[PDB]
């Protein structure tokens, strides 16, 4: 499909930042795209044969590129936290345009607030069992800035998606704080028989993206990078 | 430029949803309705022409001089909660509408409602309140403590067995919380 990376990023203002999106095999035209949750989609710029052929009314500091394999790449230079958005990319042969998954950039002032989720699954109750012969397990992510985190659910090593349900929405954890945490719930239901076999794993993931190796940390705590949270639980006859 | 509804839809499963979208440029070549979910990309629902469209449940109309373009879905399903974009495309470029949310409400076959107490596996006191198995019409309020986090409504799908429930989580860094206490507006669950 359309792959565009890096997937998420962090950086503070004024920073630079460089984007890339790889087309469909065969498809010439690749199209940028910025969505803001205050604003819908606005375009950028496209291009074609390594040519901008099409403006966007965007600020010269969103540089765009293409090169011959018709791979492009996008940069933007003195970042502003207006900046922070979803880039979504577009390929086309050149009449339907296909979507990446998209760039999520957030613009923060301070690296500092940056926080690692905590996550914990819960077991199913007794008396869920008993009147309903079915078991939710739930997943419970918290204490996590900036919004942006990835669950799913593992059961016996394998990555399951019938049965779950993960809100759209992270809660703020404190809503009248600008600079608050964020926290995620999500469930996983499955038969009564399932949860009561104990040689059944179960287990939330929780994909928090942060900084890399690249970006620098100078405090006390431990620097929180992109990092892999995961919590767990065992069937249990009663 | 393209104007469409505000919303959010929210309409029952198997109702009959309309889409309103407006433009300026009467003379775009292509027109378009794409999906996408919240934490996803857009998606091409359906072409747009002037002798409008139908794709199964999915049917559209284009009146160029009123410059009119509408979508139409027939029994609406939970998959088909998502933001419907009306897209122009004049040259190359795709103009956007500001999207209409449209969600879906599915019908509880069998409503058993109940507020269950899930323990933490980590051998800890720690503790969440699943209300669960209720109809989709009451509406789940936010907590009004400042310590207490009470998630939005999440529909559950177990296609394993055709089951649908509606779910809702709460808890708490208080020492005085308890599952009794954690919810507001409810029918009747049972509160064990
Ligand atoms: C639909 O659009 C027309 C004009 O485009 C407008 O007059 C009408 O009020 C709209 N209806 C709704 C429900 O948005």
């Known amino acids: 499909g359309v792959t565009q990376t890096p997937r998420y990023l962090i950086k503070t203002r004024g920073q630079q930042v460089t984007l890339s999106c790889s087309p469909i095999?065969?498809?010439?035209?690749v199209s940028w795209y910025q969505q803001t949750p205050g604003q819908g989609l606005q375009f950028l710029f496209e291009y074609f044969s390594e040519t901008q052929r099409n403006k966007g009314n965007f600020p010269g500091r969103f540089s765009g590129r293409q090169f011959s394999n018709s791979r492009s790449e996008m940069n933007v230079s003195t970042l502003e936290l207006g900046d922070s958005a979803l880039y979504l990319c577009a390929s086309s042969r050149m009449d339907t345009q296909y979507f990446g998954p998209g760039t999520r950039l957030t613009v923060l002032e301070d690296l500092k607030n940056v926080f690692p989720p905590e996550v914990a699954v819960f077991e199913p109750s007794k008396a869920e069992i008993s009147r309903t012969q079915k078991a939710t397990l739930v997943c419970l992510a918290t204490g996590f800035y900036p919004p942006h985190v990835e669950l799913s659910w593992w059961v016996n090593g394998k990555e399951v998606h019938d049965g779950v349900c993960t809100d759209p929405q992270p809660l703020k954890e404190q809503p009248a704080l600008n600079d608050s945490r964020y926290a995620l719930s999500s469930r996983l239901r499955v038969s009564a028989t399932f949860w009561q076999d104990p040689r059944n794993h179960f287990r939330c993931q929780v994909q928090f993206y942060g900084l890399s190796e690249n970006d620098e940390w100078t405090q006390d705590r431990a620097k929180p990078v992109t990092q892999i949270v995961s919590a767990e639980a065992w069937g249990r006859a009663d | 430029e393209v104007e469409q509804d505000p919303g959010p839809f929210n309409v029952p499963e198997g109702a009959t949803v309309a889409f309103n979208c407006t433009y300026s440029?009467?003379?775009?070549?292509?027109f378009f309705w794409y999906r996408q979910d919240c934490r996803k990309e857009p998606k091409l629902l359906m072409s747009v022409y002037s002798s409008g469209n139908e794709d199964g449940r999915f049917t559209a109309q284009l009146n160029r001089a009123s410059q009119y373009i509408s979508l139409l879905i027939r029994d609406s399903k939970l998959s088909d909660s998502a933001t419907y974009l009306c897209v122009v495309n004049p040259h190359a470029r795709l103009m956007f509408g500001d999207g209409t949310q449209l969600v879906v409400k599915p019908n509880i076959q069998n409503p058993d409602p109940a507020v269950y107490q899930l323990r933490d596996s980590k051998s800890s006191d720690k503790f969440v309140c699943l209300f669960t198995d209720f109809d989709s019409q009451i509406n789940v309020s936010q907590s009004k403590d400042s310590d207490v986090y009470i998630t939005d409504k999440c529909v559950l799908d177990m296609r394993s067995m055709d089951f649908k429930s509606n779910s809702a989580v709460a808890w708490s860094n208080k020492s005085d919380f308890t599952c009794a206490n954690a919810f507001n507006n409810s029918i009747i669950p049972e509160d064990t």
């Open positions: 440029n009467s003379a775009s070549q292509s």
């Open positions: 095999s065969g498809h010439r035209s």
